[PDB]
Coordinates of C-alpha atoms in Angstrom, one line a residue:
Chain A
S995 CA -31.6 1.8 -8.4
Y996 CA -28.9 4.4 -7.0
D997 CA -27.7 3.9 -3.6
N998 CA -24.6 5.2 -1.7
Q999 CA -25.0 4.4 2.1
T1000 CA -23.5 2.3 4.6
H1001 CA -25.6 -0.3 7.0
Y1002 CA -24.6 -1.9 10.0
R1003 CA -26.1 -5.2 10.8
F1004 CA -25.4 -6.3 14.3
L1005 CA -25.2 -9.9 15.4
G1006 CA -24.4 -11.7 18.4
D1007 CA -21.2 -11.7 20.7
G1008 CA -20.5 -8.3 19.4
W1009 CA -19.8 -9.0 15.8
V1010 CA -21.0 -7.0 12.8
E1011 CA -21.9 -7.2 9.2
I1012 CA -20.7 -3.7 7.8
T1013 CA -22.2 -3.4 4.5
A1014 CA -20.7 -0.7 1.9
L1015 CA -22.8 0.9 -0.7
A1016 CA -21.2 2.8 -3.3
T1017 CA -22.8 4.4 -6.6
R1018 CA -21.2 6.9 -8.7
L1019 CA -21.5 8.4 -12.4
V1020 CA -18.4 7.9 -14.4
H1021 CA -17.3 9.7 -17.6
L1022 CA -15.0 8.4 -20.6
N1023 CA -13.5 9.7 -23.5
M1024 CA -12.1 8.0 -26.9
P1025 CA -8.8 6.5 -26.1
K1026 CA -6.8 8.7 -28.3
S1027 CA -4.1 5.8 -29.0
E1028 CA -6.2 3.5 -31.2
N1029 CA -3.3 0.6 -30.8
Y1030 CA -1.3 -0.3 -28.0
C1031 CA 1.8 1.9 -27.5
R1032 CA 5.2 1.0 -26.2
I1033 CA 6.4 4.3 -25.0
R1034 CA 9.6 5.1 -23.3
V1035 CA 10.7 7.7 -20.6
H1036 CA 14.0 9.4 -19.7
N1037 CA 14.1 12.5 -17.7
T1038 CA 17.8 13.6 -18.8
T1039 CA 16.7 17.1 -17.7
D1040 CA 17.3 16.0 -14.3
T1041 CA 19.5 12.8 -14.4
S1042 CA 22.2 14.8 -16.1
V1043 CA 23.1 16.7 -12.9
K1044 CA 25.5 15.4 -10.6
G1045 CA 23.5 15.9 -7.2
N1046 CA 20.1 14.4 -8.9
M1047 CA 19.5 10.7 -9.2
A1048 CA 16.7 10.4 -6.7
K1049 CA 14.6 12.0 -9.2
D1050 CA 15.1 9.4 -11.7
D1051 CA 11.9 8.7 -13.7
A1052 CA 13.5 6.5 -16.3
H1053 CA 11.2 3.2 -17.4
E1054 CA 9.3 2.1 -20.3
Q1055 CA 5.6 1.6 -19.8
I1056 CA 3.1 0.2 -22.3
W1057 CA 0.0 2.4 -23.0
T1058 CA -3.2 0.5 -23.8
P1059 CA -6.5 2.1 -25.2
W1060 CA -8.3 0.7 -22.1
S1061 CA -9.4 2.6 -19.0
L1062 CA -9.3 1.2 -15.6
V1063 CA -11.9 1.3 -13.1
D1064 CA -10.5 0.7 -9.4
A1065 CA -12.2 1.7 -6.5
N1066 CA -9.7 0.4 -4.1
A1067 CA -9.9 3.5 -1.7
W1068 CA -11.7 3.7 1.6
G1069 CA -12.3 7.1 0.6
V1070 CA -15.0 6.0 -2.1
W1071 CA -17.1 3.5 0.1
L1072 CA -17.3 5.0 3.6
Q1073 CA -18.5 8.1 4.5
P1074 CA -16.7 10.6 6.5
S1075 CA -18.8 10.3 9.7
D1076 CA -18.9 6.5 9.2
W1077 CA -15.3 6.0 9.4
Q1078 CA -15.5 7.8 12.7
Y1079 CA -18.3 5.5 14.3
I1080 CA -16.0 2.6 13.4
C1081 CA -12.8 3.7 15.0
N1082 CA -14.5 4.9 18.1
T1083 CA -16.4 1.7 18.5
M1084 CA -14.6 -1.4 16.8
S1085 CA -11.5 -3.3 17.9
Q1086 CA -10.7 -5.0 14.6
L1087 CA -11.8 -5.3 10.9
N1088 CA -11.5 -7.7 7.8
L1089 CA -12.7 -7.7 4.4
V1090 CA -15.5 -10.3 3.5
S1091 CA -16.9 -10.0 -0.1
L1092 CA -16.9 -7.9 -2.9
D1093 CA -19.6 -7.1 -5.8
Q1094 CA -19.8 -4.7 -8.5
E1095 CA -22.4 -3.5 -11.3
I1096 CA -22.8 -1.2 -14.2
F1097 CA -25.7 0.4 -15.8
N1098 CA -27.4 3.3 -17.5
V1099 CA -24.7 3.4 -20.3
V1100 CA -25.1 6.7 -22.2
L1101 CA -23.2 7.0 -25.5
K1102 CA -23.3 10.3 -27.3
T1103 CA -21.4 11.9 -30.2
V1104 CA -20.3 15.6 -30.7
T1105 CA -20.7 17.5 -34.1
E1106 CA -19.0 21.0 -34.1
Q1107 CA -21.2 22.6 -36.5
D1108 CA -22.2 26.4 -37.0
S1109 CA -19.1 27.3 -39.2
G1110 CA -21.3 30.0 -40.7
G1111 CA -22.1 32.1 -37.6
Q1112 CA -19.3 31.4 -35.1
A1113 CA -18.2 28.1 -33.7
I1114 CA -20.7 26.0 -31.6
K1115 CA -20.7 22.3 -30.5
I1116 CA -24.1 20.1 -30.8
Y1117 CA -24.5 16.8 -28.9
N1118 CA -26.7 14.2 -29.5
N1119 CA -26.7 10.3 -28.2
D1120 CA -26.3 7.1 -30.1
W1121 CA -27.8 3.8 -29.3
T1122 CA -26.1 1.6 -32.0
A1123 CA -22.7 3.0 -30.3
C1124 CA -21.4 0.4 -27.8
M1125 CA -19.1 0.3 -24.7
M1126 CA -16.9 -2.7 -24.2
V1127 CA -16.1 -4.2 -20.5
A1128 CA -14.1 -7.1 -19.3
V1129 CA -12.8 -8.3 -16.1
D1130 CA -9.2 -9.9 -15.4
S1131 CA -10.9 -12.3 -13.1
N1132 CA -7.8 -14.6 -13.6
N1133 CA -5.4 -11.7 -12.9
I1134 CA -3.3 -12.5 -16.0
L1135 CA -2.6 -8.8 -16.8
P1136 CA -0.1 -6.8 -14.4
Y1137 CA -1.9 -5.5 -11.1
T1138 CA -2.2 -1.7 -11.4
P1139 CA -3.8 0.1 -8.2
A1140 CA -5.4 3.3 -9.0
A1141 CA -4.4 4.5 -5.2
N1142 CA -0.8 3.9 -6.3
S1143 CA -1.3 7.3 -8.1
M1144 CA -4.4 8.6 -6.7
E1145 CA -6.5 8.1 -9.9
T1146 CA -9.1 6.1 -8.2
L1147 CA -12.7 7.2 -8.4
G1148 CA -14.1 10.4 -6.6
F1149 CA -14.6 10.4 -2.9
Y1150 CA -17.5 12.8 -3.5
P1151 CA -21.2 11.0 -4.2
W1152 CA -22.8 14.0 -5.8
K1153 CA -19.9 14.6 -8.1
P1154 CA -19.0 12.2 -11.0
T1155 CA -15.8 10.8 -11.9
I1156 CA -13.6 9.4 -14.5
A1157 CA -11.4 6.3 -14.9
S1158 CA -7.7 6.2 -15.0
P1159 CA -6.3 4.9 -18.3
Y1160 CA -4.5 1.3 -18.0
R1161 CA -1.0 1.2 -18.5
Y1162 CA 1.6 -1.3 -17.3
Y1163 CA 5.4 -1.4 -17.1
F1164 CA 8.0 -3.4 -19.5
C1165 CA 11.6 -4.7 -19.3
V1166 CA 14.3 -2.4 -20.5
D1167 CA 17.5 -2.3 -18.1
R1168 CA 18.2 1.0 -16.9
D1169 CA 21.5 2.3 -15.6
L1170 CA 22.8 5.3 -13.8
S1171 CA 26.2 6.1 -11.7
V1172 CA 26.6 7.7 -8.4
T1173 CA 27.4 11.2 -8.1
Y1174 CA 27.3 14.1 -5.3
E1175 CA 26.6 17.9 -5.4
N1176 CA 29.2 19.1 -8.0
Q1177 CA 32.1 16.1 -7.6
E1178 CA 34.4 16.0 -10.3
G1179 CA 34.4 14.3 -13.6
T1180 CA 31.3 13.0 -15.8
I1181 CA 28.4 10.9 -14.7
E1182 CA 29.9 8.1 -16.2
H1183 CA 27.2 6.4 -18.2
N1184 CA 23.3 7.2 -17.8
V1185 CA 22.4 4.5 -20.4
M1186 CA 18.6 3.4 -20.8
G1187 CA 18.4 0.1 -22.9
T1188 CA 16.6 -2.0 -25.2
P1189 CA 14.1 -5.0 -24.8
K1190 CA 15.6 -8.3 -23.9
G1191 CA 13.9 -11.5 -25.4
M1192 CA 13.6 -13.3 -22.1
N1193 CA 11.7 -10.7 -20.2
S1194 CA 9.6 -9.3 -23.0
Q1195 CA 6.1 -9.6 -22.0
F1196 CA 3.3 -7.7 -24.3
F1197 CA -0.2 -8.8 -23.3
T1198 CA -3.5 -7.6 -25.1
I1199 CA -7.1 -6.9 -23.3
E1200 CA -8.4 -8.7 -26.4
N1201 CA -6.4 -12.0 -26.0
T1202 CA -6.9 -12.1 -22.3
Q1203 CA -10.4 -11.5 -21.5
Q1204 CA -13.9 -12.1 -22.6
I1205 CA -15.0 -8.6 -23.5
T1206 CA -18.6 -7.6 -23.4
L1207 CA -20.3 -5.0 -25.6
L1208 CA -22.8 -2.9 -23.8
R1209 CA -25.2 -0.5 -25.7
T1210 CA -27.6 2.2 -24.4
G1211 CA -30.0 -0.1 -22.7
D1212 CA -27.5 -2.8 -21.5
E1213 CA -26.0 -3.3 -18.4
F1214 CA -23.3 -5.5 -16.6
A1215 CA -22.9 -7.3 -13.3
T1216 CA -19.9 -9.1 -11.7
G1217 CA -19.8 -12.2 -9.7
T1218 CA -19.3 -12.2 -5.9
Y1219 CA -15.7 -12.2 -5.1
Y1220 CA -15.1 -13.7 -1.6
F1221 CA -12.0 -12.0 0.4
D1222 CA -9.5 -14.4 2.1
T1223 CA -7.6 -12.0 4.3
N1224 CA -6.3 -11.5 8.0
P1225 CA -8.1 -9.0 10.0
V1226 CA -6.4 -5.7 11.2
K1227 CA -6.7 -4.3 14.9
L1228 CA -8.2 -0.9 15.3
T1229 CA -6.1 0.0 18.4
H1230 CA -2.6 1.3 19.1
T1231 CA 0.0 -0.1 21.2
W1232 CA 2.5 1.9 23.3
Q1233 CA 4.6 -0.5 25.3
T1234 CA 8.4 -0.6 24.6
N1235 CA 11.2 -3.2 25.8
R1236 CA 10.9 -1.1 29.0
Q1237 CA 7.5 -1.6 29.8
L1238 CA 7.1 -5.7 29.5
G1239 CA 6.3 -7.6 32.5
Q1240 CA 7.0 -7.5 36.2
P1241 CA 8.1 -4.1 36.8
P1242 CA 10.9 -3.4 39.5
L1243 CA 10.0 -3.8 43.1
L1244 CA 9.5 -0.9 45.2
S1245 CA 11.4 0.1 48.6
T1246 CA 10.2 3.6 48.8
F1247 CA 6.8 5.2 48.9
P1248 CA 6.3 8.5 48.2
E1249 CA 5.2 11.2 50.7
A1250 CA 2.9 13.6 48.8
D1251 CA 1.8 13.9 45.4
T1252 CA 5.2 15.4 44.2
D1253 CA 8.1 13.3 45.0
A1254 CA 8.6 9.8 43.7
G1255 CA 9.6 6.4 45.0
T1256 CA 12.9 4.1 44.8
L1257 CA 14.0 0.9 44.0
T1258 CA 16.5 -1.7 45.3
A1259 CA 20.3 -1.4 45.1
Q1260 CA 21.0 -2.5 41.4
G1261 CA 23.9 -4.5 42.7
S1262 CA 21.8 -6.4 45.3
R1263 CA 18.6 -6.8 43.5
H1264 CA 17.1 -9.8 42.0
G1265 CA 16.4 -10.5 38.2
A1266 CA 18.4 -11.4 35.2
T1267 CA 20.2 -9.9 32.3
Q1268 CA 22.5 -10.8 29.3
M1269 CA 25.4 -8.5 30.4
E1270 CA 28.4 -9.9 32.6
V1271 CA 27.7 -6.8 35.3
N1272 CA 26.8 -8.1 38.7
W1273 CA 23.7 -5.5 38.9
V1274 CA 20.3 -5.0 37.5
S1275 CA 18.3 -2.0 35.8
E1276 CA 15.5 -1.6 33.3
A1277 CA 17.7 -0.6 30.5
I1278 CA 19.6 -3.9 30.6
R1279 CA 17.1 -6.4 31.8
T1280 CA 15.8 -9.0 29.6
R1281 CA 12.7 -8.6 27.6
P1282 CA 10.2 -11.2 25.9
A1283 CA 11.4 -10.1 22.4
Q1284 CA 12.2 -7.0 20.2
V1285 CA 9.6 -4.2 20.0
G1286 CA 10.2 -2.8 16.5
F1287 CA 13.8 -2.3 15.1
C1288 CA 16.6 -0.1 13.6
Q1289 CA 16.1 0.4 10.0
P1290 CA 18.7 1.7 7.3
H1291 CA 18.0 5.4 6.8
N1292 CA 17.5 6.4 2.9
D1293 CA 18.6 3.2 1.7
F1294 CA 18.7 3.5 -2.0
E1295 CA 19.6 0.1 -3.8
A1296 CA 19.8 -0.6 -7.5
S1297 CA 19.0 -3.4 -9.9
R1298 CA 18.8 -3.8 -13.7
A1299 CA 15.8 -1.4 -13.4
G1300 CA 17.8 1.4 -11.7
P1301 CA 18.0 3.0 -8.2
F1302 CA 15.1 3.1 -5.8
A1303 CA 14.0 4.1 -2.4
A1304 CA 14.0 0.7 -0.3
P1305 CA 10.7 0.3 1.5
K1306 CA 10.4 0.6 5.4
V1307 CA 7.8 -0.6 7.8
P1308 CA 5.9 2.4 9.1
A1309 CA 6.4 3.0 13.0
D1310 CA 6.2 5.7 15.6
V1311 CA 8.1 8.8 14.9
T1312 CA 9.1 9.1 18.4
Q1313 CA 10.1 12.2 20.6
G1314 CA 13.1 12.3 18.0
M1315 CA 10.7 13.5 15.2
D1316 CA 12.6 11.1 12.8
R1317 CA 10.2 10.7 9.9
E1318 CA 12.4 9.1 7.3
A1319 CA 13.7 7.0 9.7
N1320 CA 10.6 5.2 10.8
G1321 CA 9.2 5.0 7.4
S1322 CA 6.3 7.6 7.8
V1323 CA 4.5 8.4 4.5
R1324 CA 3.7 11.5 2.7
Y1325 CA 0.7 11.6 0.3
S1326 CA -0.3 13.9 -2.5
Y1327 CA -3.9 13.8 -3.5
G1328 CA -6.0 16.5 -5.2
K1329 CA -9.8 17.5 -5.4
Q1330 CA -11.3 14.5 -6.1
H1331 CA -9.2 12.4 -3.5
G1332 CA -9.5 15.2 -0.8
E1333 CA -8.0 18.6 -1.0
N1334 CA -9.9 22.0 -0.7
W1335 CA -11.7 22.7 -3.9
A1336 CA -11.1 26.5 -3.4
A1337 CA -7.4 25.9 -3.8
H1338 CA -5.9 27.5 -6.7
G1339 CA -3.0 26.4 -9.1
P1340 CA -2.4 22.7 -9.9
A1341 CA -0.5 22.5 -6.6
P1342 CA -1.6 19.2 -5.1
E1343 CA -2.2 19.1 -1.2
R1344 CA 0.0 16.7 0.9
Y1345 CA 0.2 15.2 4.2
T1346 CA 2.8 13.2 6.2
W1347 CA 1.1 10.1 8.5
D1348 CA 3.1 9.2 11.5
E1349 CA 2.1 5.5 12.6
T1350 CA 0.4 5.5 16.0
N1351 CA 2.0 2.1 17.2
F1352 CA 4.2 3.5 19.7
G1353 CA 6.9 1.7 21.4
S1354 CA 8.0 0.5 18.1
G1355 CA 9.4 3.6 16.9
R1356 CA 13.1 4.7 17.2
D1357 CA 15.0 7.9 18.1
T1358 CA 18.3 8.1 16.3
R1359 CA 19.9 10.6 18.8
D1360 CA 19.7 8.4 21.7
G1361 CA 20.4 5.2 19.7
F1362 CA 24.2 3.8 20.5
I1363 CA 26.2 0.8 20.9
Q1364 CA 28.7 -0.1 23.4
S1365 CA 31.7 -2.6 23.2
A1366 CA 33.2 -5.7 24.6
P1367 CA 32.5 -6.8 28.4
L1368 CA 30.0 -3.7 29.1
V1369 CA 31.5 -0.8 31.1
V1370 CA 29.6 1.4 33.3
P1371 CA 30.8 4.4 32.1
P1372 CA 31.8 3.6 28.4
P1373 CA 35.2 5.2 27.3
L1374 CA 35.3 7.2 23.9
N1375 CA 36.5 4.3 21.6
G1376 CA 34.5 2.2 23.4
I1377 CA 31.0 3.3 22.2
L1378 CA 29.8 4.4 19.1
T1379 CA 27.0 6.9 18.9
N1380 CA 24.8 8.9 16.5
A1381 CA 27.7 11.6 16.4
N1382 CA 30.5 9.3 14.8
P1383 CA 31.2 9.7 11.2
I1384 CA 31.3 6.4 9.3
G1385 CA 33.3 5.8 6.0
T1386 CA 34.8 9.3 5.9
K1387 CA 31.7 11.1 6.3
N1388 CA 30.2 13.4 9.0
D1389 CA 26.4 13.2 8.6
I1390 CA 26.7 9.3 7.9
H1391 CA 26.3 7.6 11.1
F1392 CA 25.5 3.9 12.1
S1393 CA 22.1 4.7 12.3
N1394 CA 21.8 5.2 8.3
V1395 CA 22.9 1.9 7.7
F1396 CA 22.1 -0.5 10.8
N1397 CA 19.6 -3.1 10.4
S1398 CA 18.4 -4.3 13.9
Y1399 CA 15.7 -6.8 12.4
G1400 CA 15.8 -10.2 13.7
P1401 CA 14.0 -13.3 15.1
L1402 CA 12.9 -11.6 18.3
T1403 CA 11.8 -8.6 16.2
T1404 CA 8.2 -8.5 16.4
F1405 CA 6.1 -5.3 15.5
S1406 CA 2.7 -4.1 14.5
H1407 CA 0.8 -4.0 11.2
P1408 CA 0.4 -0.4 9.8
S1409 CA -3.0 1.1 10.1
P1410 CA -4.9 2.5 7.1
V1411 CA -5.7 6.0 6.5
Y1412 CA -9.4 6.9 5.6
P1413 CA -9.5 9.0 2.7
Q1414 CA -6.7 8.1 -0.2
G1415 CA -5.6 5.1 1.8
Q1416 CA -5.6 1.9 0.0
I1417 CA -7.8 -1.3 1.0
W1418 CA -6.5 -4.4 -0.5
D1419 CA -3.5 -5.7 -2.7
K1420 CA -2.7 -8.2 -5.0
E1421 CA 0.0 -10.8 -3.5
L1422 CA 3.5 -11.0 -5.6
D1423 CA 3.8 -14.3 -7.4
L1424 CA 7.0 -15.0 -5.6
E1425 CA 7.9 -18.3 -4.0
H1426 CA 8.5 -16.5 -0.6
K1427 CA 6.1 -13.9 0.2
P1428 CA 6.9 -10.8 2.3
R1429 CA 5.4 -10.7 5.8
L1430 CA 3.2 -8.0 4.5
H1431 CA 2.6 -4.9 2.4
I1432 CA 2.6 -1.2 3.2
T1433 CA 0.7 -0.1 0.1
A1434 CA -2.4 -1.8 1.8
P1435 CA -3.6 -3.4 5.1
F1436 CA -5.3 -6.3 3.2
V1437 CA -3.5 -9.0 1.1
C1438 CA -5.5 -11.6 -0.7
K1439 CA -3.7 -14.8 0.5
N1440 CA -5.1 -16.6 -2.5
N1441 CA -6.3 -15.1 -6.0
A1442 CA -7.2 -11.4 -5.9
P1443 CA -10.2 -9.3 -7.2
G1444 CA -10.1 -9.5 -10.9
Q1445 CA -9.2 -5.8 -12.3
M1446 CA -12.1 -4.0 -14.3
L1447 CA -11.4 -2.4 -17.5
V1448 CA -13.4 -0.3 -19.9
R1449 CA -13.1 1.1 -23.7
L1450 CA -15.4 2.7 -25.7
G1451 CA -16.3 1.0 -28.9
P1452 CA -14.2 2.4 -32.0
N1453 CA -17.1 4.2 -33.7
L1454 CA -16.0 4.7 -37.7
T1455 CA -16.8 7.0 -40.4
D1456 CA -17.6 6.5 -44.1
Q1457 CA -14.0 7.2 -45.2
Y1458 CA -12.0 4.0 -43.9
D1459 CA -8.7 2.5 -45.1
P1460 CA -6.7 0.2 -43.1
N1461 CA -3.7 0.6 -45.3
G1462 CA -4.1 4.5 -44.8
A1463 CA -1.7 5.9 -42.5
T1464 CA -3.9 7.7 -39.6
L1465 CA -7.7 7.8 -40.4
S1466 CA -10.8 9.6 -38.9
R1467 CA -13.4 8.2 -36.5
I1468 CA -16.6 9.8 -35.5
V1469 CA -16.2 11.8 -31.9
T1470 CA -17.7 9.9 -29.2
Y1471 CA -17.9 9.9 -25.5
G1472 CA -19.8 7.9 -22.8
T1473 CA -21.2 8.0 -19.2
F1474 CA -22.6 5.2 -17.1
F1475 CA -23.1 4.4 -13.3
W1476 CA -21.3 2.0 -11.1
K1477 CA -22.8 0.1 -8.0
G1478 CA -20.4 -1.6 -5.5
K1479 CA -21.1 -3.8 -2.6
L1480 CA -18.5 -4.3 0.1
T1481 CA -19.3 -6.3 3.2
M1482 CA -17.0 -6.6 6.0
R1483 CA -16.7 -8.4 9.4
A1484 CA -15.6 -6.6 12.8
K1485 CA -16.1 -7.1 16.3
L1486 CA -16.9 -4.1 19.0
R1487 CA -14.2 -3.4 21.6
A1488 CA -14.8 -3.9 25.3
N1489 CA -14.8 -1.1 27.9
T1490 CA -12.4 -2.5 30.4
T1491 CA -10.4 0.3 31.4
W1492 CA -11.9 3.1 33.7
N1493 CA -10.5 6.3 32.7
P1494 CA -12.2 7.4 29.4
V1495 CA -10.4 6.7 26.4
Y1496 CA -9.3 8.9 23.8
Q1497 CA -11.9 9.5 21.0
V1498 CA -11.9 10.8 17.6
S1499 CA -14.0 13.9 18.1
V1500 CA -14.5 17.1 16.3
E1501 CA -14.3 20.5 17.6
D1502 CA -15.9 24.1 17.3
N1503 CA -15.0 26.5 14.5
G1504 CA -11.3 27.1 15.5
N1505 CA -7.8 26.5 14.7
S1506 CA -8.0 22.9 15.7
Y1507 CA -6.8 20.2 13.5
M1508 CA -10.4 18.6 14.3
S1509 CA -12.5 21.7 13.0
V1510 CA -16.0 21.0 11.6
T1511 CA -15.8 23.6 9.1
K1512 CA -13.0 21.4 7.4
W1513 CA -15.7 19.0 6.3
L1514 CA -18.6 21.3 5.7
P1515 CA -19.3 23.1 2.1
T1516 CA -18.6 26.8 1.4
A1517 CA -20.8 29.5 0.6
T1518 CA -20.1 28.1 -3.3
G1519 CA -20.0 24.5 -2.2
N1520 CA -16.3 23.7 -1.9
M1521 CA -15.0 21.3 0.6
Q1522 CA -12.1 18.8 1.5
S1523 CA -11.3 15.5 2.9
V1524 CA -8.8 15.5 5.5
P1525 CA -7.2 12.1 6.6
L1526 CA -8.7 10.5 10.0
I1527 CA -7.1 8.8 13.0
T1528 CA -7.2 5.0 12.7
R1529 CA -6.9 3.1 16.1
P1530 CA -8.1 5.9 18.7
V1531 CA -8.3 3.5 21.4
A1532 CA -5.1 2.3 23.3
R1533 CA -4.8 -1.5 23.2
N1534 CA -1.9 -3.3 25.3
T1535 CA 0.5 -5.6 23.8
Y1536 CA 1.5 -7.5 27.1
Chain B
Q792 CA 28.5 -39.5 18.3
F793 CA 29.7 -42.6 16.6
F794 CA 27.1 -44.5 14.9
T795 CA 27.3 -48.0 13.1
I796 CA 25.5 -49.3 10.3
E797 CA 25.1 -52.5 11.9
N798 CA 23.2 -51.0 15.1
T799 CA 21.0 -48.6 13.1
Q800 CA 19.7 -50.6 10.0
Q801 CA 18.3 -54.0 9.3
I802 CA 21.0 -55.2 6.7
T803 CA 19.8 -57.6 4.0
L804 CA 22.0 -60.3 2.5
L805 CA 21.8 -60.6 -1.4
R806 CA 23.4 -63.4 -3.3
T807 CA 23.6 -64.1 -6.9
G808 CA 20.2 -64.8 -7.8
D809 CA 18.7 -62.7 -5.2
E810 CA 17.1 -59.2 -5.5
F811 CA 15.8 -56.1 -3.2
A812 CA 13.0 -53.8 -3.8
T813 CA 12.1 -50.5 -1.3
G814 CA 8.9 -49.1 -0.2
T815 CA 7.4 -46.1 -2.2
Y816 CA 8.4 -43.0 -0.4
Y817 CA 5.7 -40.3 -1.1
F818 CA 7.3 -36.8 -1.4
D819 CA 5.6 -33.9 0.8
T820 CA 7.1 -30.7 -0.7
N821 CA 6.3 -27.6 -2.2
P822 CA 6.2 -27.1 -6.1
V823 CA 8.5 -24.7 -7.8
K824 CA 8.0 -22.4 -10.6
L825 CA 9.3 -22.8 -14.1
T826 CA 9.6 -19.4 -15.0
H827 CA 11.7 -16.1 -14.3
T828 CA 10.6 -12.7 -12.9
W829 CA 12.1 -9.2 -14.0
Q830 CA 10.1 -6.5 -12.5
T831 CA 11.8 -4.5 -9.8
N832 CA 10.8 -2.0 -7.3
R833 CA 10.6 0.3 -10.3
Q834 CA 8.0 -1.8 -12.1
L835 CA 5.4 -2.2 -9.6
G836 CA 1.8 -1.1 -10.3
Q837 CA 0.5 2.1 -11.7
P838 CA 3.1 3.6 -13.8
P839 CA 3.6 7.5 -13.7
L840 CA 0.9 9.3 -15.9

């Protein structure tokens, strides 16, 4: 029984049991590599350049003749409209349980005959043929998010989809030196490396999971994994260290709707600050804590694996348009995962998501630091600004190396993106876990949903010799349906303001970002999936 | 802060043929893994296609 809907079961006190029903046809071909491959990759074509090193793609993954089936993407469960309904009504959400099923396994073989006429291809199924499925329920094999490369499943129901072959990383110990523009001399050593005996881990689907053979009239069903995660708010904050608590007392009241009021003499005004000055002001007054913080810009660190961009907690872009300063993210999807279908060339569509947790972002331009016993008008050498060169570099200011993180440093968890966006994520087997993940909003406190793998049964020919180099195998491919159940808990927000709040609405056919025509089919049936606003309603931090 | 073994603990005298035994303290700690990691920000998840 096919089914791809979304049911909202309302309970008491304003709690809802959201149910996600996703069914989709899948396609799989014979895994070319009949055996596991430990292939290496070195892009000397770019790593050799002086200015290039941020394009480093050196590593050594292990290719497995298996294909992974990951549906870890909101865009595959919920329907565009549905996500809207949610964000506009809810106030928080959390994962409940998962359930998957497989059925209607079709296995066909191809026979390119008609050599005495032209070159036609004949198709016909095979029952005896068999597919292979297993579930890494214990999570032995490395975790591989399909959305970590936009290789999940189709976001469009009436349009089939294929699985992304499974492949994991391996220890190698890469190395690359630092160089700029042209500089002078050589790139020292851009060595790759060999496998170490202490960090060598070669797993095998066969010696890790109980594979199950499924023929034509067979079908498989998983258990019912229960999610143990923390709910995420569906609202955005705005307040900053300036708007926290009792606002200054007013001594002057406006006469008309034009002019404003005044405060009390900074010197003769009550309050408390952390400075030695004998006055008060919003900018220096004490605050409950720290809203957001300064993060090192473009911080590229390096270990035995090589250089990499140190992840940074997403935040408000601020008036300063500082994207790469507040960790905003840029995605690159394609067709199945969004993007218009009438787009030519392999050019993948992109989009930069700027977090809406205002008051937590930072503007480098205005960011400064005074010195010693604070002075009213700071001298010149008594105040460093985002205009002072550090370490003999003109464009390198304190901002690109300052870390304002600390005890009082409190912030807001990043909101997920509708299409493309990732749902949950396995936790690192590290003694001391990270306060959160940016890859996804929900992290399984305990064990995580076992990954699902698939593989077509190696259909042999009459001529077979193991000792024989590379030998034939009857051409084959298969298709099957996948049903998924995703239940979630959430509570409806409460209308308490007065002034109508911001809602995620659409607009007539216009140049507006919210144009209906954007989610509507074309004269030929083409269409796209544009990311949608999460947390349209404002909240209140203090 | 000047402490004194005498004004803090109940000392016990033990002669030649004497002997002492403590209670049975129960440890309340967190286990430690006996394996090493290797993965870095380069080897985390879905490797390039």
